[PDB]
Amino acid sequence: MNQNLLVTKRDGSTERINLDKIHRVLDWAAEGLHNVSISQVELRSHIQFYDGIKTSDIHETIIKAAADLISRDAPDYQYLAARLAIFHLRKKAYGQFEPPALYDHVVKMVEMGKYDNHLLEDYTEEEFKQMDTFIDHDRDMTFSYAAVKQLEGKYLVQNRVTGEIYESAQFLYILVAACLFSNYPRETRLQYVKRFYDAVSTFKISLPTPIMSGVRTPTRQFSSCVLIECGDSLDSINATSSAIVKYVSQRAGIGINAGRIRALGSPIRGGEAFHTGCIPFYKHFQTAVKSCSQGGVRGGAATLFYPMWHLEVESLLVLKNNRGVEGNRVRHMDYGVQINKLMYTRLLKGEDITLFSPSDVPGLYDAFFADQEEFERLYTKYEKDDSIRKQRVKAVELFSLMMQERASTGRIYIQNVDHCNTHSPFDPAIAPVRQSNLCLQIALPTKPLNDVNDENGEIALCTLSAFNLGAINNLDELEELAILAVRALDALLDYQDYPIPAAKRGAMGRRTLGIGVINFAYYLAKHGKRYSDGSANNLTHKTFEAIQYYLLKASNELAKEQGACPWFNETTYAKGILPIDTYKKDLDTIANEPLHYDWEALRESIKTHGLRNSTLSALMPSETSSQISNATNGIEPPRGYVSIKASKDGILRQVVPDYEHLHDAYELLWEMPGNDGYLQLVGIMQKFIDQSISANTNYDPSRFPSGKVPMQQLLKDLLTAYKFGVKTLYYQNTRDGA
Amino acid sequence: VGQIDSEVDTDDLSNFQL
Amino acid sequence: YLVG
C-alpha cells in the first residue's frame, strides 16, 4: 500500500519510481506533433516495467514504444521517438540534457584522445566561445527516429567496446565545419565555419559517412572509393593488387579496370605467363578485395571493367552465374561491360562483333575510349588482317548474353565509353575516361601503376557531397551552397592522407569533386511532376543547369582566390569547352527549357582564371546520408511510402517526407509503367553532370505476358539509354513490391 | 532472379537511331 | 588565376 517499483540508476543504484518525471519528458517530446498518443506510448512501455529496472531501460522501452507506432497515418511518431532518443543520448553523453560549452567539451575530448589535438592549436578559447554562439542544440529535435539511429549507429564519436556515446550531432557539425575551414585567414575563417555549420545542420548539404564520422578525430583516412587501372604486366597486376589491399583495409569501395590484361592463349611476354588469361588474375583481385573482411566474403566490394570486344568476353560475362565450374567463376565482384557506338551498330544491323585480345591489336584499346573514328579504322583494319588472332560472335548473341547475365544477377553494368569521352570535362587525347568506380557514378582519368609506390601512376578518388533538393526554397540558394560544398571538399583534399603515391598524384593534380543531389523524388512531388510521363523534363533541365552553373561558378571563384588545379590544362574546360557544348544532341527533342544562366560570361571566366577542381558533379546513390535528412535517396523514386530497416533495437521505419500532403503526388518505383520516363530524366541530368550518374533499370514481371521480361524490352531500354547519352547503367531491379 | 524470354527481333531494332 |  506503498507498492512502488524501484528504478536503479548508473551505480547510484536504488530509488523509487517517477512516473510523473516520465510523463513530463514524453509530453515535452510530443510538443508540436499531430496524431501521437502519449497514453498509448505509456501503456505499451509501463507494462514491461519490472521492480529493479535500470533507468536506461525505461528510456529504451519508451523509445521503442514510440518507435513501434510509426506509420503512414501517424508519421509524427518518428519525431516523438527521435526526440526521446535524442534526450536519452544527451543524458548518456553529458549527464544532463544541456550540452557543455563547446570549449570545455573539446578540451575534455582532446585529453581523452577522441578529438584531434590540432583543434585546440588552430582555434583559441575565444574562437570556441564564438562558435558555441553559432550552435543551436534545438536542431537535434528535427531529426527523425531513423536518422537518430544512424547518427547513434555510425556518426557520433563513441567507444565501440563500452558503448559510451561521447558527443551530440551539433558538436559533430560545428567541428566538421571547424576542421575543414581551419586553414582560412582569420578574416573569413569563422564566417565560413558558421555558414557551413548552418548548411549541414539544416540538412542543405549532405556529407559522406567517413567524413561525418571522422573529421574532428585523430584519423586522416576519409576515402569512400578509389579507381585503379591495371596494366598488362605482372608488375602492374602485383601493384594493382597491393593498392587494393591497402585501400580495402580502409573500407574503400574499389573500381578496377582490368580490360588490358591479355587473353588466354596469347604469347608469354618474356617471362610473364598470361597463357592462362584474365580469370586467374580476376580471382586474385577478388581475394585482394576481400582480404580485410569478415569470413573471406563479408564486406569489401569492387567492380571490374572490360571492353565488350575483349577476346575472353563470353567467359567474363558469366563470371557471377552460380551454376558453373568453380575455377571459371569469380562470383563476388560486380562487372562493368564497356561499349561504344560501333558495337551497338553491329547489334542493330544484325552483323558480327569481332573479339580480340588487346595485346594483339595495336592502338585499338586507346582508340576505343579516345577517338571513335580511329577505333573504327583500326577495328575494320584488324578484322580483315588474318594474321591477327580473333573470334567472331553474332552481335545479337553477345548482347543477349550480357543482358541475360545483367538480368539474373542485376550486377552486370554497362559503360558507354564514347559518351564518357565525347561529353566529358577532360581531353580524351591526354586524360581519357576508361572506367568507372564501384557504383558507376565516377568518371575520371587513371594511369596504371608499375609498383605500389610508382609516382607516375594515377589512382582516381571519390570526393563527394550532396545538395538536398528538398531543403532549398529556390534554385538561387544553390550559389551559396555550391560555395560551401566546393570550398569544404577542396579543403578536405589537402586535409586527408594518401596511402598510395598515385592516389595523392590524382587528387593534387586534378582536385576532382563529385557533388550530386538527394531528395530528388520528393522535390519532383512538391512540384507535381512524375518520373514516367516526361512531365519533369524541363524542371529537371532547369534544376541541373542551376546545380552545374553554381558549382562551376564557385570553383571558378575559388581558382581566382587560390589558383586552378595543377593539371587544369588537361580539361576541356581549359580550352573554353562547356558541358552545354558537348551533350548528346537528341536531348534537344525531349526538353525545351532554355538556359537561365550566363554561360558565356562563365566560359570566359573559366578560360581566364581556370577551375580549382577539374570535375564538380556526380550523382551517386545514397542510403545513409539520405536517411539522416529524412529524404528520398539520390535521384531514385521510393519503393513505397514506408521503408523498413532491421536493427538490434527492433524495426526502424521511416515515412517518406510530407506523406500527409504528397501521397498522391509521389510516383513509387513500381508504379512507373517502364523505364523511358526515368532514362529521359537521367539523360537531361547528364547534360550538365561532369562525371556520371548511378542509373538503374527496373522491370516488373507482372507487367509482361507469362511473367517474363522480353529480351527485346531489355535491349530497347539499353538503346534508349544510349540514345539520350546516358554514360553508365548500374543495378537492374526485378519485382513488383520491393 | 530475372526470368526472361530470349526471343529477339533484329528487324524491329534495325530502324533505331543511335 | 592560372598557375604559371
Swiss-Prot record, chain A:
<feature type="domain" description="ATP-cone">
    <location>
        <begin position="5"/>
        <end position="95"/>
    </location>
</feature>
<dbReference type="GO" id="GO:0009263">
    <property type="term" value="P:deoxyribonucleotide biosynthetic process"/>
</dbReference>
<feature type="active site" description="Cysteine radical intermediate">
    <location>
        <position position="439"/>
    </location>
</feature>
<keyword id="KW-1015">Disulfide bond</keyword>
<dbReference type="GO" id="GO:0005524">
    <property type="term" value="F:ATP binding"/>
</dbReference>
<feature type="binding site">
    <location>
        <begin position="15"/>
        <end position="21"/>
    </location>
    <ligand>
        <name>ATP</name>
    </ligand>
</feature>
<dbReference type="GO" id="GO:0005829">
    <property type="term" value="C:cytosol"/>
</dbReference>
<keyword id="KW-0007">Acetylation</keyword>
<feature type="binding site">
    <location>
        <position position="209"/>
    </location>
    <ligand>
        <name>GDP</name>
    </ligand>
</feature>
<dbReference type="InterPro" id="IPR008926">
    <property type="entry name" value="RNR_R1-su_N"/>
</dbReference>
<dbReference type="InterPro" id="IPR013509">
    <property type="entry name" value="RNR_lsu_N"/>
</dbReference>
<feature type="binding site">
    <location>
        <begin position="232"/>
        <end position="234"/>
    </location>
    <ligand>
        <name>dTTP</name>
    </ligand>
</feature>
<feature type="binding site">
    <location>
        <begin position="623"/>
        <end position="625"/>
    </location>
    <ligand>
        <name>GDP</name>
    </ligand>
</feature>
<dbReference type="Pfam" id="PF03477">
    <property type="entry name" value="ATP-cone"/>
</dbReference>
<dbReference type="GO" id="GO:0044183">
    <property type="term" value="F:protein folding chaperone"/>
</dbReference>
UniProtKB/Swiss-Prot annotation, chain B:
<comment type="subunit">
    <text>Tetramer of two alpha (R1) and two beta (R2) subunits. The B1 protein is a dimer of alpha subunits.</text>
</comment>
<comment type="function">
    <text>Provides the precursors necessary for DNA synthesis. Catalyzes the biosynthesis of deoxyribonucleotides from the corresponding ribonucleotides. R2 contains the tyrosyl radical required for catalysis.</text>
</comment>
<comment type="similarity">
    <text>Belongs to the ribonucleoside diphosphate reductase small chain family.</text>
</comment>
<protein>
    <recommendedName>
        <fullName>Ribonucleoside-diphosphate reductase 1 subunit beta</fullName>
    </recommendedName>
</protein>
From Swiss-Prot, chain C:
<protein>
    <recommendedName>
        <fullName>Ribonucleoside-diphosphate reductase 1 subunit beta</fullName>
    </recommendedName>
</protein>
<comment type="similarity">
    <text>Belongs to the ribonucleoside diphosphate reductase small chain family.</text>
</comment>
<comment type="subunit">
    <text>Tetramer of two alpha (R1) and two beta (R2) subunits. The B1 protein is a dimer of alpha subunits.</text>
</comment>
<comment type="function">
    <text>Provides the precursors necessary for DNA synthesis. Catalyzes the biosynthesis of deoxyribonucleotides from the corresponding ribonucleotides. R2 contains the tyrosyl radical required for catalysis.</text>
</comment>
